[PDB]
Amino acid sequence: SHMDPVSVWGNTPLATVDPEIHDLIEKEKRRQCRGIELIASENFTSFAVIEALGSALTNKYSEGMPGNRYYGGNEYIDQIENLCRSRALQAFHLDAQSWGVNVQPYSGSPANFAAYTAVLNPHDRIMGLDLPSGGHLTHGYYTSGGKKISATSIYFESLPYKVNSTTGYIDYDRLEEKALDFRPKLIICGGSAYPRDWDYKRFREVADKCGALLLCDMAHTSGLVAAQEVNSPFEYCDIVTTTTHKSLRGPRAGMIFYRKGPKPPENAVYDFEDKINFAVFPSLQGGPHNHQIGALAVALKQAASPGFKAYAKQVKANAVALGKYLMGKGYSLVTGGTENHLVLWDLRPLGLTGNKVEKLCDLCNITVNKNAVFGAPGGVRIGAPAMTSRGLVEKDFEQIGEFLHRAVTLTLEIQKEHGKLLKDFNKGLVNNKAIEDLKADVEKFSALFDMPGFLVSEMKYK
Amino acid sequence: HMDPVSVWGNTPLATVDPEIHDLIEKEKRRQCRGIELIASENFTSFAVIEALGSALTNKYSEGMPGNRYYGGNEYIDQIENLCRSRALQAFHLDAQSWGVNVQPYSGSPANFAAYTAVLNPHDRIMGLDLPSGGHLTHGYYTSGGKKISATSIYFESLPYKVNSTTGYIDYDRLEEKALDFRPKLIICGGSAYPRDWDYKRFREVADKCGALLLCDMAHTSGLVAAQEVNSPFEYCDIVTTTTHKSLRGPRAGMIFYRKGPKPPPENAVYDFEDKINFAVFPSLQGGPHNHQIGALAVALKQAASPGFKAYAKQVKANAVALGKYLMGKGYSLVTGGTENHLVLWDLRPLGLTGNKVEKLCDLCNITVNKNAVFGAPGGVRIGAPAMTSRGLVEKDFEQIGEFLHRAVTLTLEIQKEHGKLLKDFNKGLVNNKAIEDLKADVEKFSALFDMPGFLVSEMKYKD
Amino acid sequence: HMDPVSVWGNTPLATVDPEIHDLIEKEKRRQCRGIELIASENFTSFAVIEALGSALTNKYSEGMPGNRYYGGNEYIDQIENLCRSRALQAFHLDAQSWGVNVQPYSGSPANFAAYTAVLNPHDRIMGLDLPSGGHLTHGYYTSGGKKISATSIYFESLPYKVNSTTGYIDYDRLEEKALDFRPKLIICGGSAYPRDWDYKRFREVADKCGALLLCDMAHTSGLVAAQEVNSPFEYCDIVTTTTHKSLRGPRAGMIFYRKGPKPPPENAVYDFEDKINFAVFPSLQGGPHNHQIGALAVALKQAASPGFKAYAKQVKANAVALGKYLMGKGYSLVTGGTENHLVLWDLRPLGLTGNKVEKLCDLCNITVNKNAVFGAPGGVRIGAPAMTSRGLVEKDFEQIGEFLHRAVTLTLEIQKEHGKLLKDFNKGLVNNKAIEDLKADVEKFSALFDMPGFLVSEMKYKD
Amino acid sequence: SHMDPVSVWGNTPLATVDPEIHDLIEKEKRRQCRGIELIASENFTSFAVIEALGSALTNKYSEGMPGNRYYGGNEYIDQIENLCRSRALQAFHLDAQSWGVNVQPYSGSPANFAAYTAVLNPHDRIMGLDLPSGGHLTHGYYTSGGKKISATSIYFESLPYKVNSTTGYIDYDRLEEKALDFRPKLIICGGSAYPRDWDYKRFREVADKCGALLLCDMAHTSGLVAAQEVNSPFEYCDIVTTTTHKSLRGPRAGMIFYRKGPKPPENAVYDFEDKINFAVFPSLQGGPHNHQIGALAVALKQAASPGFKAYAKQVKANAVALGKYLMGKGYSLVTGGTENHLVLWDLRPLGLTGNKVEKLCDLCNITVNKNAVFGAPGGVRIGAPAMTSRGLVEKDFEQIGEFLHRAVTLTLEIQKEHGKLLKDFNKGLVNNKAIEDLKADVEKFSALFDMPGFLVSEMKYK
Ligand SMILES: Cc1ncc(COP(=O)(O)O)c(CNCC(=O)O)c1O
Ligand SMILES: Cc1ncc(COP(=O)(O)O)c(CNCC(=O)O)c1O
Ligand SMILES: Cc1ncc(COP(=O)(O)O)c(CNCC(=O)O)c1O
Ligand SMILES: Cc1ncc(COP(=O)(O)O)c(CNCC(=O)O)c1O
């Protein structure tokens, strides 16, 4: 036989090497810019971030840390990771004498589990926001039947705290009481579907009374934190973890911030740095994904610009404006508003489940996600970061609410005519002219705005 | 006021971030103007890189194709389904007997997800000892008892070793340890083992002691796909792998698992699929990195080509030719040869440590890595995949051996002139004309070959 | 030369070891010349003591009757079989529905053996909080998170509490915690709880959350045998107990477990017997203490007599009469009374701590113990079994309350005169004529009654 | 109704209160003095020990330690426990500045598990002598199938070391190699059926090379240790646990010895005392069994007498003399002799199992126990302490060997005539005149010697 020439296999563009995958990426590109993307955890990152993500940085193995690698060839990888770490501190206004950061986690879930491994022993106790109350899997999750779902609940001992059953706010009194009975070694704040800000000072007061470490998972609001538009968890938390692909508008990666230097009121100093770095490598991960680190460095510089602070301001205002429109139609929002990037829409007063609204919205190129509410999820979660990154403002998000209003009206019209069971409901989705009209208006409205990451003019499917 | 989308979102990297753009360009030159001999490294294709840097990074798709948590996944599902079916085809697996999860972020997440699926916390694991060629994720604790690897933190690990004299895996001591220790899981595969694995013997040991058998084929997965080494799928219950080494894809992981009827209690069937998929999500990971999955799908298509089988053949032949050249100069290789992509070079007969040779080689743009040998590591590990991907053949790898020979000769001259201690050795690296002469010859030799992934002609830093 | 058997082996203790003989004689006088109010203490019979000190201590008999590891157990087997059948008869249990293991060395080994039988390491357990009246073996960790009890070291425990105002068990907060925490095992029973237990409600909570239900009836086992309190066998899967408290036997433990068909998946039967017996031996214990088993068999026969049911009735009536007397003086009892063998005396309304009252009472040969109350413990626990075994009735226990009243009065006089701090309090104990006067009145009152276990007439230290 | 008077229920002798149990104790008393007791773990303790064991000390609750109890009334209990501890140190020639002891363990298995809990965390690694090689359950045991039997193997991670497959001695080279692969936190020496002395110095050399603590379980030879007739484990071990009812000839209890004071070649001191005491109480046990502690104090004083050192010398000589007689008949002993209180008799060369010899011996009032040998146990374990306590010397133990020789001859005669299967073998035990003749000669021989603990003249069944 004969080996392929480098020019054939190694330099030929994707559109020629693999038409199938190229065609599917092009279809996904159109889907992203011809619908309304309301997944609260999604964003549209920049072309610059994407160019660093798709680069020769993927070829380099660089196990270890800058200045203490396991092998050579890391002269420029070290500068990239050092730039990424220093830019990570600048984006969140942290002094390098009081804070450090590890930028090697592959994603948010590796970042959280590495933080747990660093400061906790197996079976140590952890408290996190309950999933039906707005928490995340990695904060601990086991079912009513006792089945341990999350790895946090498998390798550690978790116990959730809940929001108030009626107001929807975090019950800080019941949080403190459970923390005193349970005595966790680590308390986690932050969540995935909580529509209000966090009282980190009260969390610090509870952690000090029970003797726990305080960690904040700011994955969802990290972009708002960098722009100083929400409460800063660094004022009170020992460790802060985050994703970088949500409101921060970067690549899919994770970071772990940790305190260093003198402790607040012997002459004790913090002992997190070595534990956190060792937990990431050599304990849990292998070689870093340097293409993610380089792309993250780009995203962190953009997050420090004045234009980004205006983006975070706009995300909050769009979420509020959208929430005001929905409540003006009589709809119920958890806590009756929002202070961040998302709204949590209670659908139980309409006799609807999140599944039905999400399915019909998806048929209209409106991507939301069903989400549990306090108490077959009875709500949908709606986020503003992604569509705001396309340039939408308050008036545009009121139009989104109008589309959502039309979609729920069609959901109720279908349910009233065919039935409450899924098999009955599905009958109304086949050959529905009103759905096809709603999708047409979404598509035309979505095409009105720009799209970052790629050029619509160069798209395959226009 | 918000920035216009065209300004922040569509502007090329070279304008948005000159600092990072310049550093990527410098790393591009380093990759194509030196000799890359890290056995775990490769140079992937531009096609893989174009899929890696694409709008697929924007999509959240928690769950599995056909079983997602939310919508918008019409095209993501087809990409992951294509990736899974191409993974089975690339390794010649029947879909009724094998399944695969392609969501692991990397190789270490892939191994820990497999452990979580089939093991309870503190269950016992046996893996190849690190000084014998093993990997961290197979278990590692220090002399003091400090648990380094997460495998040794959340599970109970015990290593097995190569034969103290031959350097081959001691299958007799493996079986003896397996019966004393009674592991629930035995791991085969390694990072610096220069021979093939007897998976049939591992199955005999696993059946005698009652353990599951997992193979971590990360390093030789490309050779396995091309059927140039023994296939672990013939005997192992689970096969994990990276996709960025000899497979020449993006940085990702996969978990292969058996399906269907068991081989001779009743008509029992395998029970791995649901446990493995659940362990990846929702247990350990969050949303998959769909840009990795799409790039992996491209890599798996390329791995099924006739050109890739010829590449795997060439990697093996280059490793032999390099090893044959080194032994002709009197140097010592562990097991006295190789049957895969790498050679393990024993430096103790020369009175050298792996640290010194690696440091001087790096000053000449020759990237190797110090590596423990059976027993301050006394060896260096050298791999053929990366330079073979640039088009080098046997004669070119014999010149690489000449460069290595020159480097070790300079290392001994420094040690004889300044001393055996590292601080003494460093004195010989300051303003060394012979090192700078070797660096110049490496650069000129490296510039002779093509480079996948990007165009050398469009590089920022020329010559 | 070896000593003759008659010299070392047959000589009485009074000659072999005068030092220890003298100390036992002094302890004999202390036991019958003071007021013993430790709720967990009793005075067992001479018959029990004769079996306890017998040649049964010489026999090794690892295993179970009819399933031993070696021979010579013809008579040991009959003794253990008698002990087991008498254990079921004493608590009115059908042998087809209940079994019992009588080999635990004490109560704490009995509880930990039950945990080992039905739980895996780190499984979750709920037990009565120590400040609410619980016991160490039900789980205990400090404010700092330090795991004190072995139950909290090898398992994951979480306490439930009494109502903050009434002092009764908060069954609503119990169920709420059981659903959040999801324990595999819920423990009922306690050491200082002055009311009866609603085992039916515990069964409803255990069934709703999916837990096993165990009762530790150590303190009230004598009252249970005489059917003077609620029976935990009606609702619990497992019942553990000591045998030296209200049961008035030797220091040993037992584990009762359900057998036979389950109450309404299929025709399921209980699976406790083999797990519990295996947990005791060979898992946790070695050879049983057959002298304890023989003495226990004697105690269980005595516990089945009509005289024992009258003793249990009297213990309850004495506790009420003592508590009624204390409340007539204005003192505060937790839950304002009792339904069992003890009273829990709240001293915080008097501005006193349990430590001070216990110290002054001990100087007067009145043995109580400081005990936490809901919330430097602010209470003392007082029990009726021991003094009731000496023949005291209600009028005699009202005199005991008068002694306690005098003791607390002296405690307050010292605190008012010297101070609230412990170092201040100690100043009032030096050469206190009122304390010495109270001690004299306790001695004269204590000498009025008989004493089981030994003959007061043959004591070494008379008067 | 009416309560029983104290004189009736509380002062009446056992023979009247419970004739059934009294009759069974009397039958057990005769069985003990009219047969040959060769269970290596059994002894006959003194009447003085028994009088302290059966005393009013059983009525006292005394949770805690002397000088730091939880409640009052402990003036005399404290003196008894303090006497017991100081006598424990004297019996083993320990300086109180270098060694402490806790005398509260209920038995040997509680003593070992309390020591493990004190110095180890759950799932820490332990190495102990394999059961087929002469080890004990509490040192760790899991089956070939992987079933975890011992609580040591359930709550900790155990791995056994073995004797040499041919010589029967401990393989110290393979011990060191396994310790270096496995890296235990605790190494246990001592065993239940090992017929030779221990090289504690080599055990210390292995423990120091791998970084482990060294514990000796001297339960079986504790009497020989007190009399300084075998190697002392205190010279090299960090912790020493023991029972008190075997060769020490005391009550059924346990003790934990631990090092204190300056360490051997900073100015570090030992940290065992607080950990060991806390593990016993409040961690694992409740109130001490003060009747056991008082009886133990008596036994420890007797163990310090010159008569006891002569007893330990005689136990060793009786075991050797018995072993010499058996080997003179062609029988096989593990390691071909003994250096302590027992012999391990290999029955496989005779085509016999331990079950058959033990069953036939038991029918002749000869109590041995089947015991695994290196490799359906193929051996029997025979001990000298109990019969030596009755005054038997070398000539008497050669008569025991003659009885054992006759018993095995009858076992082979039965097996040759009826078969190797248990059902075949049992046929030869029914109405066997030779067995009844052997039992008659054992009974007459056993009646020739005295019996401690009780007066044969006062027995019920003579
Ligand atoms: C055999 C093996 N398995 C798993 C991994 C982990 O892969 P990730 O870095 O993607 O987590 C490695 C990395 N081996 C790196 C080397 O030999 O240089 C490996 O060699
Ligand atoms: C608060 C939080 N933390 C961690 C993660 C995990 O991130 P990765 O998927 O990169 O592992 C998520 C994902 N949240 C997904 C969602 O809300 O839709 C999250 O919401
Ligand atoms: C060495 C050793 N250690 C501890 C124990 C346990 O002692 P207790 O039974 O008191 O728990 C034994 C019992 N050995 C019993 C035998 O060899 O027959 C033992 O032999
Ligand atoms: C309810 C309960 N359970 C178990 C135990 C332990 O029993 P042992 O001491 O035999 O291990 C106790 C001791 N309670 C002691 C007291 O209340 O004073 C107890 O009160």
Short mmCIF file of N, CA, C and O in Angstrom, two decimals, chain D residues 420-455:
data_model
loop_
_atom_site.label_atom_id
_atom_site.label_comp_id
_atom_site.label_asym_id
_atom_site.label_seq_id
_atom_site.Cartn_x
_atom_site.Cartn_y
_atom_site.Cartn_z
N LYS D 420 -14.19 -43.31 53.49
CA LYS D 420 -13.67 -41.96 53.70
C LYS D 420 -14.75 -40.90 53.86
O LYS D 420 -14.46 -39.83 54.40
N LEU D 421 -15.97 -41.17 53.42
CA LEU D 421 -17.05 -40.20 53.53
C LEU D 421 -17.59 -40.17 54.95
O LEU D 421 -17.53 -41.16 55.69
N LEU D 422 -18.11 -39.00 55.34
CA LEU D 422 -18.59 -38.80 56.71
C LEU D 422 -19.66 -39.82 57.09
O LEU D 422 -19.65 -40.35 58.21
N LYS D 423 -20.59 -40.11 56.17
CA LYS D 423 -21.63 -41.08 56.47
C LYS D 423 -21.04 -42.47 56.71
O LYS D 423 -21.52 -43.21 57.58
N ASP D 424 -20.01 -42.84 55.95
CA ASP D 424 -19.33 -44.10 56.19
C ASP D 424 -18.60 -44.08 57.53
O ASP D 424 -18.70 -45.02 58.32
N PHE D 425 -17.86 -43.00 57.80
CA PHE D 425 -17.08 -42.88 59.02
C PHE D 425 -17.96 -42.97 60.26
O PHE D 425 -17.59 -43.63 61.24
N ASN D 426 -19.11 -42.29 60.25
CA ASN D 426 -19.99 -42.26 61.41
C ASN D 426 -20.44 -43.66 61.83
O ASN D 426 -20.72 -43.89 63.01
N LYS D 427 -20.55 -44.59 60.88
CA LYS D 427 -20.96 -45.95 61.24
C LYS D 427 -20.00 -46.58 62.24
O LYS D 427 -20.43 -47.37 63.09
N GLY D 428 -18.71 -46.26 62.16
CA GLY D 428 -17.75 -46.84 63.08
C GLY D 428 -17.76 -46.26 64.47
O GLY D 428 -17.12 -46.82 65.37
N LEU D 429 -18.45 -45.14 64.69
CA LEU D 429 -18.51 -44.52 66.00
C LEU D 429 -19.65 -45.05 66.86
O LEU D 429 -19.67 -44.77 68.07
N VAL D 430 -20.59 -45.79 66.28
CA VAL D 430 -21.74 -46.31 67.02
C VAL D 430 -21.36 -47.67 67.61
O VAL D 430 -20.92 -48.57 66.89
N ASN D 431 -21.47 -47.78 68.94
CA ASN D 431 -21.23 -49.03 69.66
C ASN D 431 -19.81 -49.56 69.41
O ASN D 431 -19.60 -50.75 69.17
N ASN D 432 -18.83 -48.67 69.47
CA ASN D 432 -17.43 -49.04 69.29
C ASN D 432 -16.83 -49.29 70.67
O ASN D 432 -16.70 -48.37 71.47
N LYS D 433 -16.48 -50.55 70.95
CA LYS D 433 -15.93 -50.90 72.25
C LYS D 433 -14.57 -50.24 72.47
O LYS D 433 -14.25 -49.85 73.60
N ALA D 434 -13.77 -50.12 71.41
CA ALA D 434 -12.45 -49.52 71.55
C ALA D 434 -12.54 -48.05 71.92
O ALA D 434 -11.71 -47.55 72.69
N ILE D 435 -13.54 -47.35 71.39
CA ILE D 435 -13.74 -45.95 71.76
C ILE D 435 -14.16 -45.84 73.22
O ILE D 435 -13.64 -45.01 73.98
N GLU D 436 -15.10 -46.69 73.64
CA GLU D 436 -15.54 -46.69 75.03
C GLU D 436 -14.41 -47.09 75.98
O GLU D 436 -14.36 -46.61 77.12
N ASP D 437 -13.50 -47.96 75.53
CA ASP D 437 -12.33 -48.27 76.34
C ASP D 437 -11.37 -47.08 76.42
O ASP D 437 -10.80 -46.80 77.49
N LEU D 438 -11.19 -46.36 75.31
CA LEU D 438 -10.31 -45.20 75.33
C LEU D 438 -10.88 -44.09 76.20
O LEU D 438 -10.14 -43.43 76.94
N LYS D 439 -12.20 -43.85 76.12
CA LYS D 439 -12.82 -42.85 76.99
C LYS D 439 -12.67 -43.23 78.46
O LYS D 439 -12.43 -42.36 79.31
N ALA D 440 -12.80 -44.52 78.78
CA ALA D 440 -12.65 -44.96 80.16
C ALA D 440 -11.24 -44.70 80.68
O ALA D 440 -11.07 -44.28 81.83
N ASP D 441 -10.22 -44.92 79.84
CA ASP D 441 -8.86 -44.67 80.29
C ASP D 441 -8.55 -43.19 80.39
O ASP D 441 -7.74 -42.78 81.23
N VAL D 442 -9.18 -42.36 79.56
CA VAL D 442 -9.02 -40.92 79.67
C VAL D 442 -9.65 -40.42 80.97
O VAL D 442 -9.06 -39.61 81.69
N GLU D 443 -10.86 -40.89 81.26
CA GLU D 443 -11.57 -40.45 82.45
C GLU D 443 -10.79 -40.81 83.71
O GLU D 443 -10.63 -39.98 84.62
N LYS D 444 -10.28 -42.05 83.79
CA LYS D 444 -9.50 -42.47 84.95
C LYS D 444 -8.20 -41.68 85.06
O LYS D 444 -7.77 -41.32 86.16
N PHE D 445 -7.56 -41.40 83.92
CA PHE D 445 -6.33 -40.62 83.94
C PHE D 445 -6.60 -39.17 84.32
O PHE D 445 -5.83 -38.56 85.06
N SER D 446 -7.70 -38.60 83.81
CA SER D 446 -8.02 -37.21 84.12
C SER D 446 -8.32 -37.01 85.60
O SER D 446 -8.01 -35.96 86.17
N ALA D 447 -8.94 -38.01 86.24
CA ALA D 447 -9.28 -37.91 87.65
C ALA D 447 -8.06 -37.95 88.56
O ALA D 447 -8.20 -37.73 89.77
N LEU D 448 -6.88 -38.24 88.01
CA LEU D 448 -5.67 -38.35 88.81
C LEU D 448 -5.12 -36.99 89.24
O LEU D 448 -4.29 -36.93 90.16
N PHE D 449 -5.57 -35.90 88.62
CA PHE D 449 -4.99 -34.59 88.82
C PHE D 449 -6.00 -33.64 89.46
O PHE D 449 -7.22 -33.84 89.38
N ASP D 450 -5.47 -32.59 90.09
CA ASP D 450 -6.29 -31.57 90.71
C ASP D 450 -6.96 -30.69 89.65
O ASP D 450 -6.72 -30.81 88.45
N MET D 451 -7.81 -29.77 90.12
CA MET D 451 -8.55 -28.84 89.28
C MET D 451 -8.74 -27.50 89.97
O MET D 451 -9.35 -27.42 91.05
N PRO D 452 -8.22 -26.42 89.39
CA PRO D 452 -8.41 -25.09 89.96
C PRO D 452 -9.79 -24.53 89.63
O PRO D 452 -10.50 -25.02 88.75
N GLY D 453 -10.16 -23.48 90.36
CA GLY D 453 -11.40 -22.78 90.16
C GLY D 453 -12.54 -23.25 91.03
O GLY D 453 -13.41 -22.45 91.39
N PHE D 454 -12.57 -24.53 91.37
CA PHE D 454 -13.61 -25.07 92.23
C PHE D 454 -13.09 -26.33 92.90
O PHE D 454 -12.09 -26.92 92.48
N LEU D 455 -13.79 -26.74 93.96
CA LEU D 455 -13.41 -27.91 94.74
C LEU D 455 -14.12 -29.14 94.20
O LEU D 455 -15.35 -29.20 94.19
#
